[PDB]
Amino acid sequence: ETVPVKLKPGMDGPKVKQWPLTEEKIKALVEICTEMEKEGKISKIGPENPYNTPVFAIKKKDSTKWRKLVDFRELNKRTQDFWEVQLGIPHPAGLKKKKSVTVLDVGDAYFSVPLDEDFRKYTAFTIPSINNETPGIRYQYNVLPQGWKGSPAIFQSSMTKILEPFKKQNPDIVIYQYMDDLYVGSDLEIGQHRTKIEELRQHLLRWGLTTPDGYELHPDKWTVQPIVLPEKDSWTVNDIQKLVGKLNWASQIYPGIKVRQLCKLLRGTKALTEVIPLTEEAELELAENREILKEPVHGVYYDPSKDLIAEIQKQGQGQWTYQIYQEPFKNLKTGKYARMRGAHTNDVKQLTEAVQKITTESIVIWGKTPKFKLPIQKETWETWWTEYWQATWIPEWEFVNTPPLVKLWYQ
């Protein structure tokens, strides 16, 4: 029986427009929805419903079965009080401490509990048509839908029960539920871990078709990423400039990094390739700085009232550096990402994975997905993001334009 859902007052339902899809994807969405209609999960609606939320078609991990993916980012914002306060889900600040964290897809659970009849109208979605030749099939949800944060919020109760008999047996495995996924952590050994997960999978399945699936993470390896200076044997005027260049940039983050000591080696208009001797009277700065750069700065506390921001830089050669932060130059974390150079992998496919990577590291660490500053063209991303997308959630993003030394820095 329904669990009254209200929109944050002074706010109306979502009215986001459907993006245009390839005939291929339209086709899959049609079959899926026709089935969901049969099973009563959704129903057709009329013009008396001004609401709308986007829908894509993705391929689940490892299968050639198409999956529907409703982008509820807007409805989520318009119901935030419901799933963040009224029914919040506390996040385990130690799940990041475990040695191995597997991710399970439980979204299929929600299709059980029916949705508040008065809220339904807000889940309206539209399967588009090509070239506009037709109106668009319109459906609204009748059960909790996946992608809608209100869904795990309402279902917690039923989740908390089905999981009780397991949390008692293995009081050391940590379980976090975000969106349609379960993040199970443990200090076991890879061999056992996979066993405990299969234990959990079967447990879940006995207590009601709660059928999941599998994603291997390792928080205990997610260590820092101190910047690196390139120490050489010889040093030209240029190298020293570039060195002074990165050093005078690092000073927006690190305190004790001074360079006026090294600036005295470029003294008065000298050739560029001219090797410069290594003055010891200065090295008490380079050496001093090579260290200040290995262990992080004071402060830098995760403000939970603020938003998480993730910037990514194209490092070229299938490599991408990234940093999550809330207030410029106080990164809470920074990493890298590498592709697998053959039979596929283009910038777009990589970025898409790097984003998915960063988002999961985020959920696990802060129980919160960040907002990305994607170095790509809005329309290009809007075109292909949906091709290499596996996640069942979608973060917020925006597109940036040209990093001065911010890339040459994190290299």
Add this chain to the structure above:
Amino acid sequence: PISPIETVPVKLKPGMDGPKVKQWPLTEEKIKALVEICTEMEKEGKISKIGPENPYNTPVFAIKKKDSTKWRKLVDFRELNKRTQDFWEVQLGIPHPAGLKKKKSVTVLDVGDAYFSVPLDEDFRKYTAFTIPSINNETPGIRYQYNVLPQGWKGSPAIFQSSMTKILEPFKKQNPDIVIYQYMDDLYVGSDLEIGQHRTKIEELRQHLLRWGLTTPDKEPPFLWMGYELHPDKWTVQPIVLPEKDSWTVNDIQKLVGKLNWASQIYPGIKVRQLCKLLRGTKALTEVIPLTEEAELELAENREILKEPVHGVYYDPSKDLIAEIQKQGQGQWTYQIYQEPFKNLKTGKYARMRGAHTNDVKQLTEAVQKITTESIVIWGKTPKFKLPIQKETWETWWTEYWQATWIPEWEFVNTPPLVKLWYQLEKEPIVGAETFYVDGAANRETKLGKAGYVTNKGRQKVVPLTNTTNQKTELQAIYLALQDSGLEVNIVTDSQYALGIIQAQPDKSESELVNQIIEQLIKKEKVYLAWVPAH
């Protein structure tokens, strides 16, 4: 005849109520038609008189169709529309003719007096209450309310398309072969039957519709549809008439550019760079704006294109979709979408809006993207591109470019002009080359600056500058350097601005200076730039 179809439940916005707007008593000659027409509409059931106490009213007016003698009633519903909830936007965005699949026969049916033949949700009928006056302010009793979708009401278009979609379904089942596409009030029926077999189905539908209360008529292929002259196997845009004038206002150049753009989707080579560069200034309509030599030469080039007529072919989901791009002038591009050699599905152009020092490799990419979105919208798939660029050329730039990108399938097409990478910078300093420590600056007040350099070989220069920005100077420095240098140079600038503008390797930004620096880099064999914290 009001249809037996189900009605759609309507409601007024959350805390509102119906229009109480009082009727303006006027001409009794009008009050003549209001009763004459309401009378007929009351019989047909479109309307009904209601109990004295309906707290609402919407002004009624009366307009004579000059040419016929038959007055037409008009109800300005705008006040109700403000109080009526929102509906699923009558899905706008008219299909592009280049995407429709060709058929042997296509008929159009005017479902005009349609929406008036559709029942309106019961409980919402009262808010549609109007009041026909009388001989003279004494007998107000003439009060009705609609039972069908009132012209001009807010939710009429929405509830009609809906109702129509439902009405056609039982018919589309019995006829899976044909395809029907409803639009505002004009039905489209196409098939691959036979001219006479196709004539039996069209009359079948009419009866079907009629059995639904909707009435239909008892033009030809060369159709009227929204700017598109249609044909038995082709399409084009309604003929165009580009103005000839001695004086032009903002409002005239706008209608010109608009008309010219509309042509683009079929007329190859259309340009607007200059004609629209004119509106750069403030939108102050009817502001007579002088022409220009370029703009005048341009308007001409279009006229010569529009000379002859251009026709478009339809879609064949059987063949591939190919798109080819041609770089025209600097900053402009054109492309054609086709399935068969020279006989386009559709055409169009692209241009660098900001143009802030860009790259031909990058613009060509912006076009491929621009075409990919369009193709998906129209054909539900992307095309195979044919491009004036060398795979190696492209890879070189994408692999070294900071932004991520990705072009669909594309083969090379050696057809000058090819795509440019006129000059490349040195990734490492150049040994044995003179090093210039350029730089400059201007006074934010005086508008005066100095641009020079100091070489390692002791040589130095400093040129005086007037009406210059601290960014104009920084580029004047780099320019000087390239001028007073050999064939290989090492330049060291304090300006990230200038550094980056050059690293993006632009071209002929018709910014004389930036075009001069560029011409200089081309001449050099090896240039190496480098930046150092300002000051």
